[PDB]
Symmetry: C2
């Protein structure tokens, strides 16, 4: 579920599933942040975990 284009609630859902009890931060307006890395291009577990606490 992580190795695809993930946007909006689909992206937030992946962060929830990956980060578990650590939680995460979702900052879609951050330049070259998660939207560019996971929504406009293909996401990865490696990148998603950059956003777990």
């Amino acid at each position: 579920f992580v190795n695809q284009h993930l946007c909006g609630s689909h992206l937030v859902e992946a962060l929830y599933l990956v980060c578990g009890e650590r939680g995460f931060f979702y900052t879609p307006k951050a330049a070259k942040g998660i939207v560019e890395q996971c929504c406009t291009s293909i996401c990865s577990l490696y990148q998603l975990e950059n956003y777990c606490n």
Copy 2:
């Protein structure tokens, strides 16, 4: 959708819907943080927005 018990993906979904493009942080292990305020007791828009960026 905000004025009820909200846990797990249901809570993350509400933060997504409320915070919009500001994004948010989801920190479930924070003592007296969002889990106590929105999951084990009834959530509110006022409290959810404390977690928007």
